[PDB]
Amino acid sequence: XXGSWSAXFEVXA
């Protein structure tokens, strides 16, 4: 799914 750049994703996966 989604995911940011810095640090863990945002969706949580």
Side-chain angles (χ1 to χ4, degrees):
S4 208
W5 164 50
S6 185
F9 313 134
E10 287 190 6
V11 291

Coordinates of all heavy atoms in Angstrom, one line a residue:
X1 N 0.8 -1.2 0.0 CA 0.0 0.0 0.0 C 0.9 1.3 0.0 O 1.9 1.4 -0.6 CB -0.9 0.0 -1.2
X2 N 0.4 2.3 0.8 CA 1.0 3.6 0.8 C 2.4 3.6 1.5 O 3.0 2.5 1.6 CB 1.2 4.2 -0.6
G3 N 2.9 4.7 1.9 CA 4.2 4.7 2.5 C 5.0 6.0 2.3 O 5.1 6.5 1.1
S4 N 5.5 6.6 3.3 CA 6.3 7.9 3.2 C 7.7 7.6 3.0 O 8.1 6.5 2.8 CB 6.1 8.7 4.5 OG 6.2 10.1 4.2
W5 N 8.5 8.7 3.0 CA 10.0 8.5 2.8 C 10.7 8.3 4.1 O 11.2 7.2 4.4 CB 10.5 9.8 2.1 CG 12.0 9.9 2.2 CD1 12.9 9.0 1.9 CD2 12.7 11.1 2.6 NE1 14.2 9.5 2.1 CE2 14.1 10.8 2.5 CE3 12.4 12.4 3.1 CZ2 15.1 11.6 2.9 CZ3 13.4 13.2 3.4 CH2 14.7 12.9 3.3
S6 N 10.8 9.3 4.9 CA 11.5 9.2 6.2 C 10.7 8.3 7.2 O 9.5 8.4 7.4 CB 11.7 10.6 6.8 OG 12.5 10.5 8.0
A7 N 11.4 7.3 7.8 CA 10.9 6.5 8.8 C 9.8 5.5 8.2 O 9.6 5.4 7.1 CB 10.2 7.3 10.0
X8 N 9.1 4.8 9.1 CA 8.1 3.7 8.7 C 7.0 4.3 7.8 O 7.0 5.5 7.5 CB 8.8 2.5 8.0
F9 N 6.2 3.4 7.3 CA 5.1 3.9 6.4 C 4.0 4.6 7.2 O 4.2 4.9 8.4 CB 4.5 2.7 5.7 CG 5.5 1.7 5.1 CD1 5.4 0.4 5.3 CD2 6.6 2.2 4.4 CE1 6.3 -0.5 4.8 CE2 7.5 1.3 3.8 CZ 7.3 0.0 4.0
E10 N 3.0 5.0 6.5 CA 1.9 5.8 7.1 C 0.6 4.9 7.2 O -0.2 5.0 8.1 CB 1.6 7.0 6.3 CG 2.6 8.1 6.5 CD 2.2 9.4 5.9 OE1 1.0 9.6 5.5 OE2 3.0 10.4 5.9
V11 N 0.4 4.0 6.2 CA -0.7 3.1 6.2 C -0.7 2.1 7.3 O -1.7 1.6 7.8 CB -0.8 2.4 4.8 CG1 -1.2 3.3 3.7 CG2 0.5 1.6 4.5
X12 N 0.6 1.8 7.7 CA 0.8 0.7 8.7 C 1.1 -0.6 8.1 O 1.8 -1.5 8.6 CB 1.9 1.2 9.7
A13 N 0.6 -0.8 6.9 CA 0.8 -2.1 6.1 C 0.4 -3.3 7.0 O 1.2 -3.9 7.6 CB 2.2 -2.2 5.7

